[PDB]
């Protein structure tokens, strides 16, 4: 693989908070969106060059936000762009500056910095995580909130939607994880002692954990045994099967490639393996389902704390964003990670 670092300021040297690829992409060219302090959401055009190195092309600027933006999300179909930040307003952008975007529905109801947003598989239900100690469930078609989860007692910095559409995983600054069944709309599981995670001293504003694309396992970064990343299962969410050791800086981001790779210690037993990316404050570790040890590791590429990572639709691009105003990409050749199913 190859690593290319963006040495040109995307948002006029302001720290970058989020990155997301167009899930609706299905070819070689992928669309990437960035969020920064400059109150602008920049969607870029990312594609491999003749030498295989990633190339970034600016497409649109989205300055509707009055204040800074911390999280940007695309729909699983890629149609609608979710963007919220300091002004605490969730915008559903849509393709109506090389291109233009327009907000469809204003999903207001949050108070301050919104840190994590997750798209449901159907694309019609929203999970929003913000500092305000709550997670709100929304209707995309209706544009209105329908459920409230106020059990968080500290800064909510990470949330993900179960691909099977049964539970909701949340990570807050209180070193406490809260699981909400999508049917009962109440707390199904709660784990705080094995502390279990890192305290407020960890310097990342995000605690973004994500389910496995099949939903069988949950990957929770920023754990303490030293910094680690615990793994749970649908069979038992109250005890970790294993944790990924990351001594030094604390892990802050977990992203899984949406491409199922064939099998080439094993975390989970199914005929397919999934490659996921974990980003710490200054290091990125690349694991897979079958191998306990990581098969990839990139570090010393950004001058400040990393903020977000994102996989491409085909898995050929792995964007990395930091808080120094610069981003980076990881480029894999044809099926370098593995043979897709």
């Amino acid at each position: 693989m190859k690593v290319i670092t963006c040495e040109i300021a995307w948002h006029n040297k302001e720290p970058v908070y989020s990155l997301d690829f167009q899930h609706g992409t299905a070819g070689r060219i992928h669309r990437l969106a960035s969020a920064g302090v400059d109150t602008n959401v920049r969607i870029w055009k990312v594609e491999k060059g003749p030498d295989g190195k990633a190339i970034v092309e600016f497409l649109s600027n989205l300055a509707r936000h009055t204040k800074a933006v911390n999280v940007v999300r695309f729909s699983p179909t890629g149609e609608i762009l979710a963007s919220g930040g300091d002004d605490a307003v969730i915008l559903l952008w849509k393709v109506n500056n090389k291109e233009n975007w327009t907000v469809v529905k204003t999903l207001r109801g949050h108070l301050e910095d919104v840190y994590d947003i997750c798209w449901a598989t159907d694309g019609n239900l929203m999970a929003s995580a913000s500092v305000d100690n709550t997670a709100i469930i929304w209707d995309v078609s209706k544009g209105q909130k329908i459920s409230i989860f106020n059990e968080h007692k500290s800064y909510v910095q990470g949330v993900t939607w179960d691909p099977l559409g049964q539970y909701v995983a949340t990570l807050s600054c209180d070193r406490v994880l809260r699981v909400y069944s999508i049917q009962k709309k109440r707390v199904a599981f709660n784990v705080s002692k094995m502390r279990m995670f890192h305290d407020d001293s960890m310097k990342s504003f995000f605690r973004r954990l994500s389910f496995t694309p099949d939903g069988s396992l949950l990957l929770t970064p920023a754990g303490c045994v030293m910094n680690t990343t615990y793994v749970f299962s649908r069979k038992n969410l109250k005890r970790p099967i294993a944790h990924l050791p990351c001594p030094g800086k604390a892990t802050l981001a977990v992203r899984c490639c949406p491409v199922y790779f064939e099998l080439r210690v094993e975390l989970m037993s199914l005929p397919y393996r999934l490659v996921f990316a974990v980003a710490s404050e200054d290091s990125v570790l690349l694991y897979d389902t079958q191998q306990s040890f990581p098969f990839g590791y990139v570090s010393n590429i950004h001058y400040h704390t990393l903020s977000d990572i994102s996989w491409s639709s085909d898995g050929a691009f792995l964007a990395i964003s930091s808080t120094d105003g610069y981003c980076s990409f990881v480029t894999f050749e044809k099926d370098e990670l593995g043979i897709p199913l």
Partner: peptide
């Protein structure tokens, strides 16, 4: 300034996973 140290694809041991 920073001194970049890059490790290629070796099919490190400081990060070997320990099970429970």
């Amino acid at each position: 300034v920073l001194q970049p140290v890059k490790i290629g694809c070796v099919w490190l041991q400081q990060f070997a996973a320990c099970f429970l």
